[PDB]
Design a protein around this ligand. Structure first.
Ligand SMILES: [K+]
Ligand SMILES: [K+]
Ligand SMILES: [K+]
Ligand SMILES: [K+]
Ligand SMILES: [K+]
Ligand SMILES: [K+]
Ligand SMILES: [K+]
Ligand SMILES: [K+]
Ligand SMILES: [K+]
Ligand SMILES: [K+]
Ligand SMILES: [K+]
Ligand SMILES: [K+]
Ligand SMILES: [K+]
Ligand SMILES: [K+]
Ligand SMILES: [K+]
Ligand SMILES: [K+]
Ligand SMILES: [K+]
Ligand SMILES: [K+]
Ligand SMILES: [Mg+2]
Ligand SMILES: [Mg+2]
Ligand SMILES: [Mg+2]
Ligand SMILES: [Mg+2]
Ligand SMILES: [Mg+2]
Ligand SMILES: [Mg+2]
Ligand SMILES: [Mg+2]
Ligand SMILES: [Mg+2]
Ligand SMILES: [Mg+2]
Ligand SMILES: [Mg+2]
Ligand SMILES: [Mg+2]
Ligand SMILES: [Mg+2]
Ligand SMILES: [Mg+2]
Ligand SMILES: [Mg+2]
Ligand SMILES: [Mg+2]
Ligand SMILES: [Mg+2]
Ligand SMILES: [Mg+2]
Ligand SMILES: [Mg+2]
Ligand SMILES: [Mg+2]
Lengths: 134, 131
RNA sequence: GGAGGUAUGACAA
RNA sequence: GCCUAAGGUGGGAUAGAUGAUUGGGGUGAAGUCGUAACAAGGUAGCCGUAUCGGAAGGUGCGGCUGGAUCACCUCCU
RNA sequence: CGCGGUGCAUUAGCUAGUUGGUGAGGUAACGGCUCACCAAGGCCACGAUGCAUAGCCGACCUGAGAGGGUGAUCGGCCACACUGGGACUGAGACACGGCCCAGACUCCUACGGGAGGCAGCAGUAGGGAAUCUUCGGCAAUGGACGAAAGUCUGACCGAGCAACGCCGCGUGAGUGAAGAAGGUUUUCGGAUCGUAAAACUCUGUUGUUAGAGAAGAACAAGGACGUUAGUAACUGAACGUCCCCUGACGGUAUCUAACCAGAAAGCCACGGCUAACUACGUGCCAGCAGCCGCGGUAAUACGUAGGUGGCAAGCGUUGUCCGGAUUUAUUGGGCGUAAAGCGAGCGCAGGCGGUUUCUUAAGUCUGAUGUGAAAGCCCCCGGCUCAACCGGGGAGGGUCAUUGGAAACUGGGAGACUUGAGUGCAGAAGAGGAGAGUGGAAUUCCAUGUGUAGCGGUGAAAUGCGUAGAUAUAUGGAGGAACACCAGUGGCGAAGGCGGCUCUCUGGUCUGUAACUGACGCUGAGGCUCGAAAGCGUGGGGAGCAAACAGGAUUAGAUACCCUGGUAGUCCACGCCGUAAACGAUGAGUGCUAAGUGUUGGAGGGUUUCCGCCCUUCAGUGCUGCAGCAAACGCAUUAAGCACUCCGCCUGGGGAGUACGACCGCAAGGUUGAAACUCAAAGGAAUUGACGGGGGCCCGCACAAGCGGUGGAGCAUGUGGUUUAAUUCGAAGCAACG
């Protein structure tokens, strides 16, 4: 563009968006509205715990939880590690992070937090998966 | 239409220099004569002669080439433009290729080189870079 | 030589 | 007595939620129907428009070459 | 009061005490601040109004910088104190811990009526991923009151809690084996963990035990004297000098001595990016993953172990911001084919603009002064044992103001100029446009002779037409549409487009000349005009052609391609529509930068008896081709080269040119134009292959030309299938099956 054009219509940049939008919104019970609060995690209740299938290259029975968050948003989350003690109506803590296999899964469940148990038998990378030192 | 006769003068030199023409002619103006004189005494062109005509005069420039016809002028860039005038303060006066080139600056003391401008401790409108 | 015009076919490997 | 918060009534404006039902869209390791495009893709393709057809698409009109092949004159090396 | 710091027009209209005036009143004060009158203005595409969001700043994070992000703690300003309104008191409040009223909420009543407001310090409940003790003291500093002692001060000094952050120090040091045991792993030799451990000699930062003990205090008050001013004299006031007087922290820092290495390390990573590799276990499972991707029975990528790497009282994960991202490019990108030139013009505003004299000096440059608080980064300099941290002295920071200068450049003013641009004069060519006529060829139909069984059509056919006389042929008549030859990368036009001929009206361009004007120019958002074909409306026309449609074929099916028909439409008038691979897929203007060769319209000169040839030149139109440019293809004076001006437009693919809103349209639709969500690609050019119901050139019992067979019969044999206790296993298109 010419300088006069940039004066008339200045440069404008693409707006970025979150990879984990459900963590960006709080909820106000009084006003019954959604607040814009960036939160590293969020507590939710497991409405459904089950297994899911991956996309074409991969094949497994990935373990998820359909979690309704404290901010009223309904999200699909992944249960990392081997074996878990989650059930429906359990209270789980969600962190950000996609799972490339699962198209609709944008959050991971934090192990060792709230009702989520640490991973049995884990001995390496224990801080992930939430297991105490043996 | 022509909106920047200075840029036209610099481009005529650049294009003639590219094909190693011996000489070049341009419609005359005071600023063009000022620029031609600076190129003359800074050793970028061989000579400059002026022709009195009926319209505005003509300035003839004699381009300079070294042994093996190496080009003394590498390129010329217009800095201040009709669309965006460029002004530098005395402490903002540019150095072109760390002093191996020159910047032609218009000041209230006249049209001078970047060396002269920061000697006098003055700024002005930056006309062109020459290296 | 060059140029404008006038039926169907798993998946991975 | 004037001003006046709140409250009441009235008709509009505006924002979200929700609603029988409805629309196209995206997704989904191995469904049905055809084979429209890519070679001249077996009717060259595409563009706009109109019209018709289960469906891709077909057909008309104008346009484009981002056109395969053989056959011409101009041009030019 | 000037200036400065958010988003949205898919927000353009807003305003009526509103704008101004005249008086009056009111205020500390000017003022529509209020009012009564008289006018009607004010604001706004330089973004009014509306909507959404937000306390602002010093500063903080990031970045090479330009910038981007943020506005905790500390300081300044502002605003608010249960929600709304009001005034009182006062120098000051419309007043967090004041009043009044109203409201919602909690609480007390004897039911008549009363009370209350932690966004003060703690603390509780609730919300949340998530933030502290219902602590000591007023000693210090500051604040209120008092003459003062002093009282009050959840300011503030301290202490407590949390690795929440930053900084410092540890968890030992030295010697110590061809290298113990054990772990892991082996090619069983040895490797490796490893000088690591052990052992021996040391150390006490720390820790424990005892002891020693700060600064932070200056004071005030009071007790002594003294000096000034004043006074008759005083007490006292102001000041000066001595004595006296006070520690929350707290027995805290700190120091000293003794004693023991004794109590004091983890976390993540190790396929590539990316520093660090092997074993088992598991076998598309379980799981990993930031991206690419790992896992399908021999996985450095999953889980464990041994090693190893990085960092270390932390380490990792998630969230958020800047960077890398030139990925909005002012610094610092693009638009022929990758995303991107509006279909084209005409033009308001705006942006930009030829030469020159004088002048001005708004921009620009420069000097001085003022100011840009302190703290902070930075720079010196000191203090804490170092550092963090603290203190002192600077510097920096403004598109700041005031004032003095400069004057080239941009701008303003007064002149001058002729090259750009235009006018005049003289010429040139043209399917440029509009209107009204008109010509021949051909098709169809119609009439009439001649004439006889076909005609028409396809790959092959049939439908169809014809003995109610076809087609063909001859002579005529009617009507519509299109204009053979000329005709040409030829011409004209802004583009779309314009092709018989004649006339009328009409636009533009090109070439000379240099009489005239004297920069009058270029571009041009918004607006306006034009805009192929199809389509739409009204009224005409209708030969040929032909969506639709009918019939005949083809075919597995054919709602196609083919055939025979055929309506709209194609044509005209008028009014709509406003889109096209509206393309050179290349916006417009200007200047500059090798050559060669065609051609259209001019001009000039040198020859030629003319005709014409030769050369120079202007404006088009092509081809070839340097320099340069380009990812390549290619472009190349008709640039995609080198430059300046203005406009349009682009920012991964899909969802979408979709939805919603708006404008336009009779309608069809057009113009404007997202998001959720999803993918890690989409894409351009070129390369090597393979392939083609592409082309060219060849070969082989490949076909053709022949001879004899197989497929039919019986039987032999192999195979499939079936059967079986078993009918052993292998081979399966050519290339398994005597
Ligand atoms: K087709
Ligand atoms: K065209
Ligand atoms: K007044
Ligand atoms: K605020
Ligand atoms: K308030
Ligand atoms: K008070
Ligand atoms: K005090
Ligand atoms: K008290
Ligand atoms: K004191
Ligand atoms: K890895
Ligand atoms: K730029
Ligand atoms: K165009
Ligand atoms: K000036
Ligand atoms: K004419
Ligand atoms: K019509
Ligand atoms: K030519
Ligand atoms: K996207
Ligand atoms: K067989
Ligand atoms: Mg891992
Ligand atoms: Mg096909
Ligand atoms: Mg086809
Ligand atoms: Mg094709
Ligand atoms: Mg059809
Ligand atoms: Mg940068
Ligand atoms: Mg209070
Ligand atoms: Mg000690
Ligand atoms: Mg490596
Ligand atoms: Mg691993
Ligand atoms: Mg950037
Ligand atoms: Mg394309
Ligand atoms: Mg494109
Ligand atoms: Mg039409
Ligand atoms: Mg278009
Ligand atoms: Mg030419
Ligand atoms: Mg044969
Ligand atoms: Mg037989
Ligand atoms: Mg086998």
């Amino acid at each position: 563009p010419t300088i006069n054009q940039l004066v008339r219509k200045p440069r404008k940049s693409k707006v970025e968006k979150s990879d984990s939008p459900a963590l960006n919104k709080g909820y106000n019970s009084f006003k019954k509205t959604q607040t814009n609060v960036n939160s590293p995690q969020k507590r939710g209740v497991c409405t459904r715990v089950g297994t899911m299938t991956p996309k074409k290259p991969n094949s497994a029975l990935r373990k998820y939880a359909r979690v309704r968050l404290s901010n009223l948003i309904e999200v699909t989350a992944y249960i990392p590690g081997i074996g878990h003690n989650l059930q429906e109506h359990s209270v789980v803590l969600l962190r950000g992070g996609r799972v490339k296999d699962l198209p609709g899964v944008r959050y991971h469940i934090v192990r060792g937090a709230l009702d989520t148990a640490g991973v049995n038998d884990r001995k390496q990378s224990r801080s992930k998966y939430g297991t105490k030192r043996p | 239409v022509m909106t920047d006769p200075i840029a036209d003068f610099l481009t005529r030199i650049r294009n003639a220099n590219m094909v190693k023409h011996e000489t070049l002619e341009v419609p005359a103006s005071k600023i063009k004569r000022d620029i031609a004189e600076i190129l003359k005494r800074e050793g970028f062109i061989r000579d400059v002669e002026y022709i009195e005509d009926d319209k505005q005069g003509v300035i003839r420039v004699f381009l300079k080439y070294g042994k093996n016809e190496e080009r003394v002028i590498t390129n010329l860039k217009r800095i201040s433009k009709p669309g965006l005038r460029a002004y530098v303060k005395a402490d903002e006066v540019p150095k072109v290729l760390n002093g191996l080139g020159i910047a032609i600056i218009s000041t209230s003391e006249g049209v001078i080189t970047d060396k002269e401008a920061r000697a006098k401790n003055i700024g002005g409108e930056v006309i062109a870079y020459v290296w």
